[model samples]
Target: MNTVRSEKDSMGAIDVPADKLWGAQTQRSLEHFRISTEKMPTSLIHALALTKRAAAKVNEDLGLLSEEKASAIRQAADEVLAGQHDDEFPLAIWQTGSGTQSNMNMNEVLANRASELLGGVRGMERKVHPNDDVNKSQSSNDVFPTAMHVAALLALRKQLIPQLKTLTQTLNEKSRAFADIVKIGRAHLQDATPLTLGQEISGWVAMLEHNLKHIEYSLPHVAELALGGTAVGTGLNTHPEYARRVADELAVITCAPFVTAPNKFEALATCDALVQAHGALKGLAASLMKIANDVRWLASGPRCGIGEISIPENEPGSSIMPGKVNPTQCEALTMLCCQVMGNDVAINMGGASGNFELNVFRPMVIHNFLQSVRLLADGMESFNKHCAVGIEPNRERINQLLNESLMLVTALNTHIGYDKAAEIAKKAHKEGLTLKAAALALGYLSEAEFDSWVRPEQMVG
Candidate 1:
């Protein structure tokens, strides 16, 4: 293989780098770390693209590169941001000792493209080399981690948080829509208490909203980008003047902090930032999975399952079952949660597997972290629009279940003592009588008051 995707740009001129420009490092990365794209964290690409823009701004501000070169790198980075670098970032993240290949790959692409933009000899290292000019006073160790933080933060704010907000809003809307509907709330898959449909859905909404707040709270420090601290976090080979200058230009360009890492050693080796971020993701995922599982069971069947509500159907349930509609939205949400959980496992392992100076699993950590964000965001968006918005309660069935529930006797404890309420409940269960009948027979209240007091409305505020 020639190790180059293509040398020609739109003008049909060759854009090959001159001299030993790209070098063996990039070519080596292109050859090794060839991993599967099956679960490639799309956010990794987002980080790379963001870093490219940040890199160009840094180079220009430092007076080490031309305007044209900076413009070219910015443009190339924009393409990657828009998901146009699939073939370019094809290398597996599991390769190399120092992530040199991946880093050089980024440098090569930015430098060559920037050089082209300068109207200079394409790939010429004379005035602007990818490594020397673009990446001066920086290392992949610092840049990559910084980029990961930026990208993950973007994914959270731009994608995940908004999706969670939407999901919570959808649940609230559903609760309002079904506010008057009463149902039997089950425990251990058996009838437990009477609750309004609004109450059940309100619980789901609270879970999502609470977790979303935790996610937001967990992200601010992660946005504290680990730039400036190059090569083992000692700022070695990097100038003191470059730190704040690059941070300012980066903040202008990428719109995130170029904050200094407190301890370079901890930043490079211990992935506490990533671990904390993933912990938030895991909490969100757990809430989503719980909601999905509950919805699936609640909408399980027209005949065989609980069937408390009817979910909007996206597809035919079975080939032979003509009238059957599957809970495709719930199933999709559930499956996506499973995937996020698996990604969290990978993230946890990667976050903990670091040795001394670097976490060999940095790539994996970023990939999995970003994967969880995308999956949760995309899955929740789809579920909200499709399944959650259109859910309708089976009012008659729900009312009947609530009226027939023996657990309603427990509510009488305020008037009658626990022992008496327990007697009423036991009698109702043993004799197959409604709790209302059992309570009224026990002189708990008159028939009219029994009907009024035991209603599901009393279950809520």
Candidate 2:
């Protein structure tokens, strides 16, 4: 809509945004590939810039590229890395399968900005060409997957893992605090036996504990980078030291171990690192979903339902029903879990869809992986502060439900035979009598025997 500055790529001249940093290739993608509203994740954008910065340093060290231009590309890409020009990269995730346009979007922006920084005109490509200088020794094939790993592993380490640890700590604290409170257990949604509330919550704690191990185990694989692979796995025009040196450079920048992949062809063509990492993420969703469901069910209704536990009633549950509260936090966490599961499906399909020497579904894998991390990290954070920390067992309800359960028959079955205990429970249920009364009426035990037998506290540790 404003003034145009024509920039020419291999195809032809195209009208670029008059003042933006992007050049011909970026402009073409912006105009031609008008597909989806989803931009490639910002995590990846910063990651790509980091790779470009490291590559420029390596290229300069190898004497393959001049220091002056490498310095300019490094500075400009650092600016992009710092998100100084966040609005400059405008391309859809639905573009070409190789993420070539997104890669060029980065290259053009860096090239033009580096040109201007070197006191030359932007988009001239004379002093600092996007391919020859800024993007030297790399291709989108290698660069995209490298950035994908860097971004994914960083997000998992810095964001999701810490949040998970926080939740685990919260749940473990609750398990310890509730260790002595005996509650009626259920099997097939019917009362079965008595166990401490702490024991029930311990199951949830173990799931997360195991999930963290599974996720952390995948990090070594995810740390392997696809940089220096270039157009194919041949290391084509790149310096031999480029892969290891750039990896060492990125290791410092990202503050995580990022080793060059031992096999570039597998690195470029398959994304099993992300796929396996997200498999752990999907397992976490299943764990959280079960935990969320357990909380809401235990806190079901204050009057009619189980009501064995109380959670913070943060908001109104109903519009027409006055003064009703709901488990909205539990609902939100569970729904996010469902979305993570669905995103895992997309990741699996994308992982398997890779053809030889290249995977076309790079963007899909990275997009879904980050989305799951974002949702889980934020969802667990919110859930911990709002729901998990607010958990308190309703001791009165626990005692009442425990006393009323006919399955204290489980305890009596050891003293009296199982058949007689079953008969007593049947009569109590049919006659609507207390188990003590029913046991005495059926002559299974005296009052002393019943008192000694049906002690809930004695039944559990």
Candidate 3:
């Protein structure tokens, strides 16, 4: 059912599908590098659309582009931004190291679509030219990384941070509700001391808040855009105000503060801002992993394992086991966190691959970063909804565990001396006796004295 049309680039003519809006270069890339199923992300494509729209408007204002050309490009870019042409950007993520093909993919789509808007044929290039107009005063070196940063900021602000705050809010509510419920805390999987469940959850809340602050702090650095730098760091061919005006336009479009890079050389050569921001994301992943592990540990078993807390039984946990419920949400979240951590390694490696005025690992870097962002945002929200909100401390179990803990002997240490307290605790464990009986038998302390001093409520603080 496919038809062909002759679309020509500088490299002679190529037969592209009659229905497709891409040019010869995009058609060639599609036929050539049939790589991974991972196409460019929607966020990145939207960011690119935003970039093109801003550039066109700015170029028109500066009298660098014809009014006809800029208007058509802006309208076409608006279509792309509105997701009217998601299928138009079908290139794989593994195409060009500098993302030239994908950049051209945007350019070609915009140029061809713009030509159509102007009553010109799609592949005719009669009205809109891809290189001379659609991609006016820009190169893959600058445009690709600029798209990466813009998309990164958008994802961080719009998606990841909100989901993180959602989880943090749920944890905060749980922390306050569980604050006074004292339980035996563990060290090295051994009962160590008494602490309130509220304090434990508050620790997680503090961690998330800290990560939010760190990521927020890294935003200004990510806001630095590289649109002005054409091929290399040099701002060749483009007007000096091109970079600043485009960034301002992007800020107006996205409602987020985006600024021009102070040093194009540094901006083009190093992706340190992304590294720093993703490092914060890695911190967030670590926090989520720890929280998930702790929740599963506490919700281990209703009758056999720790069983100090309970989570929602979302579904049947196993095939063979009957009446079984599991912390599947926690498992999902921890697995996602592991992936984020692994992705952090790849992102750092990609960030390090910059040789001079360009980083060839741009696509790999942005791909992994946005992947991590999507995973964390969705994973955290899932955990919060299915697990975090449902976590409830089993008061009876918590009290029983706290009452049975031998670490309460520490309360007797001040009165009976440390060695005697240790002997008392050992006697209780070895003889299968209660702490009171063991203490009475060892003559470490009287019953009233032990009861008065070894209170879990007193030990919590």
Candidate 4:
């Protein structure tokens, strides 16, 4: 708060700042918007700093402000980004449902810091001018979404995609390494056919590739910016060239193609594009969970569960149970998938509706989206390190299962009738005999003919 006084006037008045001294409206906003304990994403915050600095430069270029003051604002925003203004970011999210209060928080912090850096009294004479210069050519509606877009693209390109590529490579290598190891394939928890260990892992590689495509396809929509639309989807109180220049500025800072959102009204009132990104995130999570579940089930037991495949032991599985080795990495990946899937649900509900001409759910949308992204990215990294990269095939056990499996009957169906093949398989299981023995006993084939018809490799197609 500031006080104005003069010698000529006996009366003096106190100037109460809107943010520092909350009025009824501010108090009401504080109560009405209750998205508590959630912090703005670090990526989005970093992007905010970049956006502020870029807008400052564009303002300077457009002659809306002096270069010196613009430089001061940019420097201060940079400082705020460097953890200088951490304490100030604790303001209430509902201070203005429009997020204007949050925007002003950034403005005031920049102004005060810039004022100090400018060798002037902080908060006096508008030395760094929050509304006039700090927020030049910006609105919370536009800048927030635009910053989110930049954050999304950064996560996908610099972090998510690279890790996914590594995962795919790991799976590909394992598939080739296990190519000749045959295993009995099960369907509906019953033995069905013969397949190479390589083929099962090949499916994992295909899923990872599918997830990679989902993320890559969604980046363009997330890359689109909403910064140019000042307020209410109109470029009111903004320069005609501000949009292009600001887009260019964000691109330079983030090194991503930060282009303009095609529609501003829809950008403000509907966050479907953000929902689209979240959906892609959910898709990736789903694939990861499925793969992880398969690994755990396949590696369930050496003598009891599955007993056909093996996974690397990461840690003790149980506190009380003896000789237990848990699939900790696979479990971690499954838990992360559940977390990401829940975050996606939150985003869907938040982005579903708004009163009119504006979506008040921006906070939740951004919050949930970033959470999902980070969880997916970090989980993939851990899975790669602990599970995928070091996975080894239980070749001996796999071969035994394949060579003894009565379920390998389907592949012989082409050579014999289904009922005849089924009878041979039943006799093999009941008599504890090999298919070759059963076939010879039943006069279905000589030993050489049985080997030719029942080879595991012949079962592939």
Decide which is better by TM-score, 1 or 4. 4
- Model 3: CA > 4 A from native: 317-323, 413-420, 440-453
Off by over 4 Å in 4: 1-36, 83-85, 92-97, 121-126, 316-323, 410-420, 430-453
Candidate 2 local lDDT, 67-128, one digit each (tens): 89999998998898777989888988878888898889888888888888988877664467
Q: What is the lDDT of every predicted structure here?
A: 0.72, 0.89, 0.89, 0.75
**How big is the positional error of residue 298 in model 3, measured in Å on the Cα after superposition?**
0.6
User: lDDT of model 4 at residue 209?
Assistant: 93
Q: What digit string (tens of lDDT, one per residue) describes model 1 on residues 224-270?
A: 66667787777887667666666566567656544656677887776
lDDT of 4 by residue, 1-461 (tens): 35431111113323334334122232233445566666566777677778889999999999998888898888888876787666555545334445555555566667766776788745444467776778787888787777777777898888888888988899899999988877888788787777788898999999999888888888888877888887788878888888889988888887888787778788777778889988888999888988998888887775677655566667755656654557888888899889888888878887887666777777667777877777777888888888878777777777777777777777678888899899998899899998778888999878777777777876676
User: All candidates: CA RMSD in angstroms?
Assistant: 4.8, 2.1, 2.0, 4.9
Estimate the TM-score of every prediction: 0.85, 0.94, 0.95, 0.86
lDDT agreement of model 3 with the native: 0.89
Please list all clashing residue pairs in model 3, or write none if there are none: none
Clashes of each: 4, 0, 0, 1
Q: Write the per-residue lDDT of candidate 3 for residues 1-461, one digit (tens) a residue.
A: 38898998888999988888988999899988898698899999999888988888998999999999899999999898888999888888888889999999999999999999999989864589888898897998899989999999999999999999999999999999998898888989888888899999999999999999988998999999999988998899889889999999999989999999999998989888999998898898898888899999998876888989988898865667754567899888889888988999998998888897788888888899999999999998889888888888889988888777787888887888889888888999999977778999977667889888887788877
